[PDB]
Amino acid sequence: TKPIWTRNPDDITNEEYGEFYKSLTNDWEDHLAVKHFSVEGQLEFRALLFVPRRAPFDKNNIKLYVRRVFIMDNCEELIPEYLNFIRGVVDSEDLPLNISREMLQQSKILKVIRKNLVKKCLELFTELAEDKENYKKFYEQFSKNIKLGIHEDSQNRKKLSELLRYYTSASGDEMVSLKDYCTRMKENQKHIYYITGETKDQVANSAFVERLRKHGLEVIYMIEPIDEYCVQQLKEFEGKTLVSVTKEGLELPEDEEEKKKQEEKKTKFENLCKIMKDILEKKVEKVVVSNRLVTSPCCIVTSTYGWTANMERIMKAQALRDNSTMGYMAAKKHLEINPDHSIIETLRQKAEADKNDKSVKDLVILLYETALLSSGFSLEDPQTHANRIYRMIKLGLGI
Amino acid sequence: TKPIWTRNPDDITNEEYGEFYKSLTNDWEDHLAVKHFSVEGQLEFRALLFVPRRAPFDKNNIKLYVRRVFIMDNCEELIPEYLNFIRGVVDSEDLPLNISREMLQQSKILKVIRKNLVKKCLELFTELAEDKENYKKFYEQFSKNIKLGIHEDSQNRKKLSELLRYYTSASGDEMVSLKDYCTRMKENQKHIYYITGETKDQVANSAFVERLRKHGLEVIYMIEPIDEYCVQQLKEFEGKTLVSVTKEGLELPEDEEEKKKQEEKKTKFENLCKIMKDILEKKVEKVVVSNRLVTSPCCIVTSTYGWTANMERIMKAQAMGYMAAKKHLEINPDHSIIETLRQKAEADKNDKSVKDLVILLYETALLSSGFSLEDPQTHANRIYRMIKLGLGI
């Protein structure tokens, strides 16, 4: 006949925790995990915390007692916003209730309680992650909560990052930790390669990954929207910096005899690049010979410090959400041509022979637009693109 | 020494209304329009309503007086939801005070005041509609509101519709009424053609209007997202019905002799149609000969009683299978590509050039509308193949 949270976790059964957690949330199924702990010293309290099995993404929810009597339901400073999916009870022995703003040790106590709550949640998540198959259940639900935390909590950011799991080009059907990706890196791989997109299947087969894959280098598939913000703050993991295969100037581990091989190509197609940058005008910033293509003739990459194809899609959809007008910035885009492709060699011949031919212009613009669609952007006037394609079909079929 | 809403509007200056509106709403600029009236038949009350200059965010804001003393701020049924941007004051003389919840309703007392407020608001909107550059100021702020009403207010739909203005294929740089569109139709046109899309320029050059435009027909450009919601309830105007150039089975007025001509084009290509309906498998529901294409070889149209291409573009903004917009592929019997395809395919329906061209054509017709591509890098590889053909590699 004592509260379930004053009892010692060693003397508490799973069915008792469960029917209690059901009791505190009307949830029809038992809890997914529980962390039950107490703290003494200057501050004394007990916390009984639960991770629910399903919790919606898209304001706190921990019951707060002082000396076994009820006080509040949503004390905001008890837990960050990104853990608000935790449900439970925190019972303190020394918190002051009557305060003026002059009194500031209410705040100090709450901060201590909060820091301990986060410490033990991160503990629990690290424990759950040691069991590979059951952690999937958790990450399935709160991977967005962890990434949100990585963005917001600078102090715990490393321990949150070790809780991340991603699909990669090496793992296929299984998601892996970052500390794993590091275990598969070569001795000449100085970077961690990621790609952002809207589906796994779209990023896995996109042009950006081509030479990276044939070089045997592993690529992380960040297919959730929150990733655009998460990776802004996850600058490096375990010493190695992360880079986007969608951004300009990819630093590929370049063996010497092949990358002077690549320097031949820079100068061979320097002329074609000038001609194309003039044909495209201010539709693009640069036209560059590529080092990340293998099978595709060209692709569109992003400026280092500006929006990504994925992020521009998100921003356009937000503008659309509140009828804001996309009126000032569109991702800076660079067009990369593949120095080893039949179409690009043919284009260099056609163009260096007559740089103002309406057919060369037509080809270069058609290439730009198809590279736009394959690289995650939307077309300005799609019917114009359709007319270019219908022309190439009539040519292909000799009309 | 008397409230303003008790004087009659002839003796009130625009600056007196202005100062009053400003004080009522804390607005930094004066009102855009004002309607001041009284009602004496069933119940006697005065109302002073204002239309603000720019449109509020998002519970109405009409102050309610009863026999010159103040009562409420958001009386629910005072004004329909879609008019909640109306600011002003209503002072009733015959208003029961100690009454209750179901009593107020059941008496049909607040419905009277509401009917009159909405009536005279629409009067105000009609009066403003008689001056293009001020109705422009108003329509700019509340065209979304008039639409909203076109959907909610059944008993007033006709009236609301005469306030609508759209860009059309005929009007160029100005928006026009529906009563306008109707005076310009030849007398064999039993339909009003509209198109929904993302920009004015995108719908103006879409394939769907090609034959409508060559044929001399006028089609309305519906470029705002609320429009998708609007025509769901906008039946017909001044007798003649609305049709989408994006939806299947376009019934355009055509000659008796043109009818037999299109039916001959219809039986010629039915073989090509079965061939494509099978190459595309589940990617579409039908392949049919088109009557709306002119220069483009094919286009994707959306089923009746089904979501639209544009509407699906908008709902994709937020992110499956609900209101599956059934897609049809319409082929132009008059196009070089479609005739050459009829030969290529009626000779070897299982050729891989025929397959590759057919899918490429389908995907391009998708992009020609509001659709997105399943796997875009796959389509890219098709385009590169075609290209390698045109250049000869």
mmCIF file of N, CA, C and O in Angstrom, chain B residues 288-353:
data_model
loop_
_atom_site.group_PDB
_atom_site.id
_atom_site.type_symbol
_atom_site.label_atom_id
_atom_site.label_comp_id
_atom_site.label_asym_id
_atom_site.label_seq_id
_atom_site.Cartn_x
_atom_site.Cartn_y
_atom_site.Cartn_z
ATOM 1 N N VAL B 288 -6.560 6.574 -74.620
ATOM 2 C CA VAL B 288 -7.645 6.982 -75.506
ATOM 3 C C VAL B 288 -7.155 8.012 -76.514
ATOM 4 O O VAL B 288 -6.177 8.731 -76.289
ATOM 5 N N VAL B 289 -7.831 8.055 -77.655
ATOM 6 C CA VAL B 289 -7.562 9.093 -78.637
ATOM 7 C C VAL B 289 -8.059 10.434 -78.095
ATOM 8 O O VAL B 289 -9.101 10.498 -77.426
ATOM 9 N N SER B 290 -7.288 11.506 -78.305
ATOM 10 C CA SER B 290 -7.610 12.791 -77.692
ATOM 11 C C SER B 290 -8.379 13.687 -78.647
ATOM 12 O O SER B 290 -8.246 13.579 -79.863
ATOM 13 N N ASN B 291 -9.139 14.616 -78.077
ATOM 14 C CA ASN B 291 -9.792 15.654 -78.857
ATOM 15 C C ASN B 291 -9.384 17.046 -78.411
ATOM 16 O O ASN B 291 -9.985 18.029 -78.860
ATOM 17 N N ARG B 292 -8.418 17.150 -77.505
ATOM 18 C CA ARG B 292 -7.943 18.425 -76.988
ATOM 19 C C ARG B 292 -6.505 18.753 -77.341
ATOM 20 O O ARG B 292 -6.072 19.881 -77.086
ATOM 21 N N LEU B 293 -5.782 17.840 -77.966
ATOM 22 C CA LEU B 293 -4.386 18.077 -78.271
ATOM 23 C C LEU B 293 -4.245 18.698 -79.643
ATOM 24 O O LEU B 293 -5.051 18.450 -80.545
ATOM 25 N N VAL B 294 -3.167 19.445 -79.827
ATOM 26 C CA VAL B 294 -2.905 19.981 -81.157
ATOM 27 C C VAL B 294 -1.437 19.771 -81.476
ATOM 28 O O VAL B 294 -1.100 18.948 -82.329
ATOM 29 N N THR B 295 -0.549 20.421 -80.751
ATOM 30 C CA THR B 295 0.847 20.275 -81.112
ATOM 31 C C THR B 295 1.545 19.202 -80.296
ATOM 32 O O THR B 295 2.509 18.598 -80.784
ATOM 33 N N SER B 296 1.037 18.917 -79.026
ATOM 34 C CA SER B 296 1.689 17.947 -78.173
ATOM 35 C C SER B 296 1.172 16.555 -78.505
ATOM 36 O O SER B 296 -0.005 16.392 -78.834
ATOM 37 N N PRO B 297 2.044 15.544 -78.408
ATOM 38 C CA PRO B 297 1.652 14.175 -78.790
ATOM 39 C C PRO B 297 0.737 13.465 -77.814
ATOM 40 O O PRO B 297 0.018 12.550 -78.236
ATOM 41 N N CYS B 298 0.762 13.821 -76.532
ATOM 42 C CA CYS B 298 -0.060 13.149 -75.536
ATOM 43 C C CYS B 298 -0.136 14.024 -74.298
ATOM 44 O O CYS B 298 0.649 14.965 -74.117
ATOM 45 N N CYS B 299 -1.118 13.710 -73.458
ATOM 46 C CA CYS B 299 -1.279 14.407 -72.196
ATOM 47 C C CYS B 299 -1.961 13.469 -71.209
ATOM 48 O O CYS B 299 -2.655 12.539 -71.598
ATOM 49 N N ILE B 300 -1.803 13.751 -69.922
ATOM 50 C CA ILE B 300 -2.366 12.919 -68.869
ATOM 51 C C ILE B 300 -3.558 13.667 -68.312
ATOM 52 O O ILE B 300 -3.438 14.844 -67.940
ATOM 53 N N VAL B 301 -4.720 13.014 -68.314
ATOM 54 C CA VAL B 301 -5.926 13.634 -67.788
ATOM 55 C C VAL B 301 -6.410 12.803 -66.614
ATOM 56 O O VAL B 301 -6.069 11.632 -66.459
ATOM 57 N N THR B 302 -7.240 13.421 -65.797
ATOM 58 C CA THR B 302 -7.613 12.862 -64.516
ATOM 59 C C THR B 302 -9.090 12.469 -64.589
ATOM 60 O O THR B 302 -9.886 13.116 -65.272
ATOM 61 N N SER B 303 -9.450 11.389 -63.903
ATOM 62 C CA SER B 303 -10.820 10.885 -63.939
ATOM 63 C C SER B 303 -11.858 11.867 -63.375
ATOM 64 O O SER B 303 -11.546 12.784 -62.609
ATOM 65 N N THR B 304 -13.103 11.707 -63.831
ATOM 66 C CA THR B 304 -14.206 12.411 -63.201
ATOM 67 C C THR B 304 -14.363 11.829 -61.815
ATOM 68 O O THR B 304 -13.966 10.688 -61.560
ATOM 69 N N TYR B 305 -14.943 12.611 -60.911
ATOM 70 C CA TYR B 305 -15.188 12.142 -59.552
ATOM 71 C C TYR B 305 -13.902 11.641 -58.897
ATOM 72 O O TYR B 305 -13.939 10.837 -57.956
ATOM 73 N N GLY B 306 -12.779 12.194 -59.329
ATOM 74 C CA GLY B 306 -11.495 11.853 -58.750
ATOM 75 C C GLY B 306 -10.641 13.086 -58.512
ATOM 76 O O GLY B 306 -10.837 14.111 -59.140
ATOM 77 N N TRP B 307 -9.682 12.988 -57.604
ATOM 78 C CA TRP B 307 -8.799 14.102 -57.307
ATOM 79 C C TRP B 307 -8.178 14.581 -58.596
ATOM 80 O O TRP B 307 -8.336 13.946 -59.615
ATOM 81 N N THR B 308 -7.467 15.697 -58.549
ATOM 82 C CA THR B 308 -6.858 16.255 -59.739
ATOM 83 C C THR B 308 -5.377 16.219 -59.723
ATOM 84 O O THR B 308 -4.776 15.927 -58.734
ATOM 85 N N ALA B 309 -4.786 16.551 -60.848
ATOM 86 C CA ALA B 309 -3.323 16.632 -60.915
ATOM 87 C C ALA B 309 -2.775 17.755 -60.031
ATOM 88 O O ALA B 309 -1.858 17.546 -59.220
ATOM 89 N N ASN B 310 -3.330 18.964 -60.181
ATOM 90 C CA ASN B 310 -2.932 20.091 -59.337
ATOM 91 C C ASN B 310 -3.209 19.817 -57.881
ATOM 92 O O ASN B 310 -2.360 20.057 -57.014
ATOM 93 N N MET B 311 -4.421 19.359 -57.592
ATOM 94 C CA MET B 311 -4.810 19.147 -56.211
ATOM 95 C C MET B 311 -3.856 18.188 -55.532
ATOM 96 O O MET B 311 -3.415 18.435 -54.407
ATOM 97 N N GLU B 312 -3.475 17.127 -56.234
ATOM 98 C CA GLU B 312 -2.474 16.194 -55.738
ATOM 99 C C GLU B 312 -1.100 16.842 -55.582
ATOM 100 O O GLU B 312 -0.319 16.430 -54.718
ATOM 101 N N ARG B 313 -0.756 17.809 -56.438
ATOM 102 C CA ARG B 313 0.495 18.545 -56.242
ATOM 103 C C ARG B 313 0.489 19.247 -54.896
ATOM 104 O O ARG B 313 1.473 19.202 -54.138
ATOM 105 N N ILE B 314 -0.633 19.903 -54.590
ATOM 106 C CA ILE B 314 -0.749 20.664 -53.351
ATOM 107 C C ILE B 314 -0.692 19.731 -52.148
ATOM 108 O O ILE B 314 0.021 19.998 -51.176
ATOM 109 N N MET B 315 -1.484 18.645 -52.173
ATOM 110 C CA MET B 315 -1.488 17.718 -51.047
ATOM 111 C C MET B 315 -0.163 16.987 -50.901
ATOM 112 O O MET B 315 0.175 16.575 -49.790
ATOM 113 N N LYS B 316 0.601 16.837 -51.986
ATOM 114 C CA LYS B 316 1.961 16.314 -51.868
ATOM 115 C C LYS B 316 2.882 17.295 -51.152
ATOM 116 O O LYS B 316 3.820 16.865 -50.474
ATOM 117 N N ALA B 317 2.575 18.584 -51.195
ATOM 118 C CA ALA B 317 3.388 19.546 -50.459
ATOM 119 C C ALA B 317 3.635 19.048 -49.022
ATOM 120 O O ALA B 317 4.747 19.159 -48.506
ATOM 121 N N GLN B 318 2.601 18.490 -48.400
ATOM 122 C CA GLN B 318 2.708 17.991 -47.032
ATOM 123 C C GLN B 318 3.129 16.523 -46.913
ATOM 124 O O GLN B 318 2.287 15.631 -46.832
ATOM 125 N N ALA B 319 4.439 16.287 -46.891
ATOM 126 C CA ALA B 319 4.983 14.942 -46.741
ATOM 127 C C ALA B 319 6.507 14.956 -46.798
ATOM 128 O O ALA B 319 7.117 15.969 -47.141
ATOM 129 N N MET B 320 -1.061 7.868 -47.986
ATOM 130 C CA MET B 320 -1.084 7.702 -49.441
ATOM 131 C C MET B 320 -2.390 7.058 -49.918
ATOM 132 O O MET B 320 -3.173 6.532 -49.108
ATOM 133 N N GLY B 321 -2.621 7.137 -51.235
ATOM 134 C CA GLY B 321 -3.613 6.338 -51.928
ATOM 135 C C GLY B 321 -5.048 6.809 -51.838
ATOM 136 O O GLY B 321 -5.916 6.193 -52.473
ATOM 137 N N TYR B 322 -5.335 7.862 -51.070
ATOM 138 C CA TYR B 322 -6.698 8.365 -50.890
ATOM 139 C C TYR B 322 -7.059 9.317 -52.025
ATOM 140 O O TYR B 322 -6.223 10.126 -52.442
ATOM 141 N N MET B 323 -8.258 9.155 -52.573
ATOM 142 C CA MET B 323 -8.678 9.955 -53.707
ATOM 143 C C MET B 323 -7.697 9.698 -54.854
ATOM 144 O O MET B 323 -7.384 10.606 -55.624
ATOM 145 N N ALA B 324 -7.231 8.456 -54.965
ATOM 146 C CA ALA B 324 -6.313 8.092 -56.034
ATOM 147 C C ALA B 324 -6.824 8.771 -57.292
ATOM 148 O O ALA B 324 -7.935 8.497 -57.745
ATOM 149 N N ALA B 325 -6.019 9.667 -57.849
ATOM 150 C CA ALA B 325 -6.426 10.405 -59.034
ATOM 151 C C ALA B 325 -6.191 9.403 -60.146
ATOM 152 O O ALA B 325 -5.050 9.040 -60.432
ATOM 153 N N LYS B 326 -7.268 8.935 -60.763
ATOM 154 C CA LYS B 326 -7.147 7.915 -61.796
ATOM 155 C C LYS B 326 -6.540 8.605 -63.001
ATOM 156 O O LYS B 326 -7.059 9.626 -63.452
ATOM 157 N N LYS B 327 -5.442 8.074 -63.528
ATOM 158 C CA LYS B 327 -4.826 8.749 -64.670
ATOM 159 C C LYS B 327 -5.252 8.102 -65.989
ATOM 160 O O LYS B 327 -5.325 6.875 -66.104
ATOM 161 N N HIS B 328 -5.524 8.938 -66.990
ATOM 162 C CA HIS B 328 -5.722 8.481 -68.357
ATOM 163 C C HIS B 328 -4.629 9.097 -69.230
ATOM 164 O O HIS B 328 -4.175 10.223 -68.976
ATOM 165 N N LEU B 329 -4.172 8.346 -70.236
ATOM 166 C CA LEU B 329 -3.236 8.848 -71.238
ATOM 167 C C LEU B 329 -4.006 9.070 -72.529
ATOM 168 O O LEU B 329 -4.617 8.138 -73.053
ATOM 169 N N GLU B 330 -4.031 10.311 -73.005
ATOM 170 C CA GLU B 330 -4.704 10.685 -74.239
ATOM 171 C C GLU B 330 -3.639 10.939 -75.297
ATOM 172 O O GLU B 330 -2.714 11.726 -75.058
ATOM 173 N N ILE B 331 -3.769 10.287 -76.465
ATOM 174 C CA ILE B 331 -2.807 10.429 -77.556
ATOM 175 C C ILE B 331 -3.441 11.219 -78.698
ATOM 176 O O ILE B 331 -4.638 11.092 -78.989
ATOM 177 N N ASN B 332 -2.608 12.033 -79.358
ATOM 178 C CA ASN B 332 -3.026 12.971 -80.393
ATOM 179 C C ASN B 332 -3.001 12.250 -81.739
ATOM 180 O O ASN B 332 -1.905 11.943 -82.238
ATOM 181 N N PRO B 333 -4.154 11.973 -82.374
ATOM 182 C CA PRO B 333 -4.146 11.172 -83.613
ATOM 183 C C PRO B 333 -3.469 11.875 -84.775
ATOM 184 O O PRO B 333 -3.270 11.257 -85.839
ATOM 185 N N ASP B 334 -3.130 13.150 -84.593
ATOM 186 C CA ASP B 334 -2.599 14.016 -85.625
ATOM 187 C C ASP B 334 -1.115 14.311 -85.452
ATOM 188 O O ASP B 334 -0.606 15.252 -86.052
ATOM 189 N N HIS B 335 -0.402 13.542 -84.660
ATOM 190 C CA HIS B 335 0.978 13.884 -84.359
ATOM 191 C C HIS B 335 1.922 12.963 -85.107
ATOM 192 O O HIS B 335 1.611 11.789 -85.299
ATOM 193 N N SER B 336 3.084 13.495 -85.510
ATOM 194 C CA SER B 336 4.094 12.674 -86.184
ATOM 195 C C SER B 336 4.451 11.452 -85.347
ATOM 196 O O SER B 336 4.505 10.315 -85.840
ATOM 197 N N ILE B 337 4.689 11.679 -84.064
ATOM 198 C CA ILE B 337 5.131 10.620 -83.175
ATOM 199 C C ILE B 337 4.043 9.572 -83.011
ATOM 200 O O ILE B 337 4.319 8.368 -82.996
ATOM 201 N N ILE B 338 2.788 9.993 -82.944
ATOM 202 C CA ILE B 338 1.772 8.995 -82.668
ATOM 203 C C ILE B 338 1.484 8.161 -83.916
ATOM 204 O O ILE B 338 1.289 6.949 -83.820
ATOM 205 N N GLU B 339 1.506 8.770 -85.108
ATOM 206 C CA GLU B 339 1.356 7.990 -86.336
ATOM 207 C C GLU B 339 2.534 7.031 -86.532
ATOM 208 O O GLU B 339 2.342 5.814 -86.729
ATOM 209 N N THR B 340 3.765 7.552 -86.439
ATOM 210 C CA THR B 340 4.928 6.672 -86.537
ATOM 211 C C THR B 340 4.846 5.560 -85.500
ATOM 212 O O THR B 340 5.231 4.418 -85.767
ATOM 213 N N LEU B 341 4.336 5.873 -84.310
ATOM 214 C CA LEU B 341 4.184 4.850 -83.289
ATOM 215 C C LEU B 341 3.151 3.810 -83.704
ATOM 216 O O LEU B 341 3.329 2.615 -83.441
ATOM 217 N N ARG B 342 2.087 4.232 -84.397
ATOM 218 C CA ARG B 342 1.084 3.267 -84.826
ATOM 219 C C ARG B 342 1.695 2.274 -85.799
ATOM 220 O O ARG B 342 1.413 1.080 -85.731
ATOM 221 N N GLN B 343 2.573 2.737 -86.677
ATOM 222 C CA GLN B 343 3.272 1.810 -87.566
ATOM 223 C C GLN B 343 4.263 0.918 -86.808
ATOM 224 O O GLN B 343 4.269 -0.302 -86.986
ATOM 225 N N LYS B 344 5.166 1.520 -86.018
ATOM 226 C CA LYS B 344 6.157 0.743 -85.264
ATOM 227 C C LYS B 344 5.513 -0.374 -84.463
ATOM 228 O O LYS B 344 6.016 -1.504 -84.437
ATOM 229 N N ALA B 345 4.387 -0.068 -83.814
ATOM 230 C CA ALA B 345 3.738 -0.959 -82.872
ATOM 231 C C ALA B 345 2.795 -1.931 -83.559
ATOM 232 O O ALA B 345 2.797 -3.119 -83.224
ATOM 233 N N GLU B 346 2.013 -1.481 -84.549
ATOM 234 C CA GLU B 346 1.193 -2.439 -85.282
ATOM 235 C C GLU B 346 2.041 -3.395 -86.101
ATOM 236 O O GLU B 346 1.519 -4.409 -86.559
ATOM 237 N N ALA B 347 3.332 -3.126 -86.273
ATOM 238 C CA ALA B 347 4.191 -4.104 -86.921
ATOM 239 C C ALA B 347 4.829 -5.067 -85.919
ATOM 240 O O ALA B 347 4.869 -6.275 -86.169
ATOM 241 N N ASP B 348 5.309 -4.583 -84.776
ATOM 242 C CA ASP B 348 5.839 -5.494 -83.747
ATOM 243 C C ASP B 348 5.508 -4.867 -82.394
ATOM 244 O O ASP B 348 6.297 -4.091 -81.854
ATOM 245 N N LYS B 349 4.338 -5.221 -81.858
ATOM 246 C CA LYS B 349 3.907 -4.636 -80.601
ATOM 247 C C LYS B 349 4.881 -4.937 -79.478
ATOM 248 O O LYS B 349 4.881 -4.227 -78.473
ATOM 249 N N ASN B 350 5.742 -5.936 -79.637
ATOM 250 C CA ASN B 350 6.678 -6.309 -78.588
ATOM 251 C C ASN B 350 8.105 -5.824 -78.868
ATOM 252 O O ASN B 350 9.060 -6.373 -78.317
ATOM 253 N N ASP B 351 8.279 -4.854 -79.759
ATOM 254 C CA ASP B 351 9.591 -4.249 -79.958
ATOM 255 C C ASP B 351 9.989 -3.450 -78.718
ATOM 256 O O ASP B 351 9.145 -2.864 -78.031
ATOM 257 N N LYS B 352 11.290 -3.419 -78.432
ATOM 258 C CA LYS B 352 11.735 -2.666 -77.269
ATOM 259 C C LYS B 352 11.902 -1.184 -77.550
ATOM 260 O O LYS B 352 11.823 -0.395 -76.606
ATOM 261 N N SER B 353 12.097 -0.770 -78.809
ATOM 262 C CA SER B 353 12.000 0.658 -79.113
ATOM 263 C C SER B 353 10.596 1.169 -78.891
ATOM 264 O O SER B 353 10.406 2.249 -78.317
#
